[PDB]
Design a protein around this ligand. Structure first.
Ligand SMILES: *[C@@H]1O[C@H](CO)[C@@H](O[C@@H]2O[C@H](CO)[C@@H](O[C@@H]3O[C@H](CO[C@H]4O[C@H](CO)[C@@H](O)[C@H](O)[C@@H]4O)[C@@H](O)[C@H](O[C@H]4O[C@H](CO)[C@@H](O)[C@H](O)[C@@H]4O)[C@@H]3O)[C@H](O)[C@H]2NC(C)=O)[C@H](O)[C@H]1NC(C)=O
Ligand SMILES: *[C@@H]1O[C@H](CO)[C@@H](O[C@@H]2O[C@H](CO)[C@@H](O[C@@H]3O[C@H](CO)[C@@H](O)[C@H](O[C@H]4O[C@H](CO)[C@@H](O)[C@H](O)[C@@H]4O)[C@@H]3O)[C@H](O)[C@H]2NC(C)=O)[C@H](O)[C@H]1NC(C)=O
Ligand SMILES: *[C@@H]1O[C@H](CO)[C@@H](O[C@@H]2O[C@H](CO)[C@@H](O[C@H]3O[C@H](CO)[C@@H](O)[C@H](O)[C@@H]3O)[C@H](O)[C@H]2NC(C)=O)[C@H](O)[C@H]1NC(C)=O
Ligand code: D5M
Ligand code: TMP
Ligand code: TMP
Ligand code: ZN
Ligand code: ZN
Ligand code: ZN
Length: 255
C-alpha cells in the first residue's frame, strides 16, 4: 500500500493492542515517532534501496492462477526460499519473540509494514505483470498502473470524495464496522493456531487479485465510478483485516 493504507492499518492496529504490546511498542519506537506506530509504518518503503535485500520482501509473485503456496511461491527472483512478504513476516515475528543479534526496532517496523503489504491483493499476484505494475490504464482522467490504483488511488479517491479529506474518517468508519458489522468475522481474522499466519492472508490476497483487482481490467481501460464503488468494500475489508491481524500478532508476540 501507499502512505494512506499503511497509516489506516497501523491506526486500527494501535487501538487493538493489549497493555503488554502497547508497552513494548512504546519502548521499541524511537522518540521522534512521539509514540505513534502509524508515523513509521511507511519506514520499510523508505529503505528498499538502502537495504537492497529488502525490496522483494514487500510482495509475493505467483504463477498465472488464483493460488498461493509458500514452498512454491515464497522466493525471490534469485530463487532464494523465504524471500517474500510471508517469509519476512515469519522472520520479523520470530525476532520480536526475543523481546538478540537483531535490531528489534527495525523488526517492529518491518512486521508492521509487511502485515499491511501482505493484505494488498496485488502484492500477492502475478510475476508476469509484476503485480499489476505493467497494466497501464486510466484512473478517471489520469494515467495510472493497476498496482498503483490498489496501493493508492482507490484509497485517496475515497479519502477526498467520500470522507471530505479526513483520513481519520475512514479509520473511524472501519473501527465502527469492526465492532458492529463484522464482529464474528473479526474473531476469525484474529485466530492463528501458530505466532503469525501469513500464508492464510496471502491465499486470500491472490484470490482477491483474481476476483476483484485483475477482474475486468485490460490495458488502456478507463477505471472510474463503476470500478471504484464496486472495489471499495474489498479495500475496506483488507485494510480492516490488516489492522486486526497486525494487533493480534503483536499481542501474541509480546504476551
Ligand atoms: C530477516 O531479517 C534480517 C534482519 O533484517 C535480514 O537480514 C539481512 O539479510 C540480508 C541478506 O538477505 C543481509 O544483506 C546481505 O549482507 C551481506 C553481508 O552482510 C554481513 O553483515 C550482516 C550484518 O549487517 C551479518 O548478517 C553478516 O555479518 C553478513 O556477512 C552482503 O554480502 C549482501 O550484499 C551483497 O549481495 C547482494 C545480493 O546477494 C547484492 O545485491 C549486494 O550488492 C552485495 O553484493 C547483502 O547486503 C543483511 O546484512 C541482513 N541484515 C541483518 C541485520 O542481519 C534477513 O534478510 C531477513 N530475511 C527474510 C525476511 O527472509
Ligand atoms: C535500530 O534501527 C533504527 C532504524 O534503522 C535506527 O534508528 C535510526 O538511526 C539513524 C542513525 O542513527 C537515524 O538517522 C539519523 O537521523 C539523524 C536525525 O537526528 C541525523 O542527524 C543523522 O544524519 C547524520 O548521520 C548520517 C549517517 O549515515 C549521515 O549520512 C548524515 O549526513 C548525518 O551526518 C541520521 O540521518 C534514523 O533517524 C533512525 N531511524 C529511526 C526510524 O529512528 C537505530 O539507531 C538502530 N539501533 C541500533 C543500531 O542500535
Ligand atoms: C460499514 O458498514 C456499512 C454497512 O454495511 C457500509 O455501508 C453500506 O455500504 C454498502 C456498500 O458496501 C451499501 O450497499 C449498497 O449496495 C448496493 C449494491 O451495489 C448498491 O447498489 C446500493 O446503492 C447500496 O447502497 C449500503 O447502502 C451501506 N449501508 C448504509 C447503512 O449506509 C459502509 O460502507 C461500511 N464502511 C466501511 C468503512 O467499511
Ligand atoms: N508450507 C509451509 N507452511 C508454513 N511454514 C513453512 C512452510 N514451508 C516452509 N515454512 C517455514 C516458514 C518459517 O520460516 C518456518 C516456521 O514456520 P511455522 O509455521 O511458524 O512453524 O517454516
Ligand atoms: C528466524 C529467522 C529467519 N530468517 C529468514 C530465513 C527465511 O528465509 C525466512 C523465514 O524463516 P523461518 O522463520 O525459519 O526468514 C532469518 O534471516 N533470520 C532469522 O533469525
Ligand atoms: C516487481 C513487483 C513489485 N511489486 C510492488 C512493490 C511496489 O509496491 C510496487 C512498485 O515496485 P517497483 O517500483 O519495484 O516496480 O509494486 C509487486 O507487488 N509485485 C512485483 O512483482
Ligand atoms: Zn505498502
Ligand atoms: Zn505496492
Ligand atoms: Zn511496501
Amino acid at each position: 500500500w501507499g502512505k494512506e493504507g499503511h497509516e489506516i492499518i497501523c491506526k486500527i492496529a494501535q487501538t487493538r493492542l493489549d497493555e503488554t504490546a502497547a508497552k513494548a511498542v512504546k519502548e521499541l519506537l524511537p522518540e521522534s515517532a512521539e509514540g505513534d506506530l502509524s508515523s513509521l509504518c511507511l519506514w520499510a518503503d523508505r529503505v528498499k534501496f538502502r537495504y537492497h535485500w529488502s525490496s522483494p520482501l514487500h510482495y509475493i509473485n505467483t504463477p498465472d492462477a488464483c493460488s498461493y503456496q509458500y514452498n512454491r511461491d515464497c522466493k525471490d527472483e534469485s530463487g532464494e526460499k523465504g524471500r517474500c512478504v510471508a517469509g519476512a513476516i515469519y522472520n520479523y515475528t520470530t525476532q520480536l519473540l526475543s523481546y538478540s543479534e537483531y535490531n528489534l526496532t527495525e523488526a517492529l517496523l518491518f512486521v508492521s509494514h509487511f502485515m499491511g503489504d501482505i493484505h494488498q491483493p496485488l502484492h500477492v499476484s502475478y510475476a508476469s505483470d509484476k503485480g499489476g505494475n505493467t497494466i497501464e490504464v486510466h484512473w478517471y482522467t489520469r494515467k495510472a498502473n493497476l498496482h498503483h490504483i490498489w496501493d493508492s488511488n482507490i484509497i485517496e479517491t475515497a479519502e477526498a470524495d467520500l470522507y471530505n479529506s479526513a483520513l481519520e474518517g475512514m479509520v473511524d468508519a472501519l473501527k465502527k464496522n469492526i465492532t458492529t458489522e463484522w464482529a464474528d468475522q473479526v474473531k476469525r481474522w484474529e485466530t492463528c493456531t501458530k505466532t503469525a499466519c501469513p500464508d492464510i492472508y496471502a491465499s486470500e490476497g491472490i484470490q482477491a487479485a483474481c476476483d476483484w483487482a485483475y477482474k475486468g481490467v485490460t490495458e488502456g481501460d478507463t477505471l472510474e465510478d463503476e470500478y471504484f464503488y464496486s472495489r471499495l468494500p474489498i479495500v475496506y475489508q483488507r485494510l480492516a483485516q490488516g489492522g486486526v491481524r497486525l494487533a493480534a500478532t503483536l499481542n501474541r508476540i509480546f504476551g
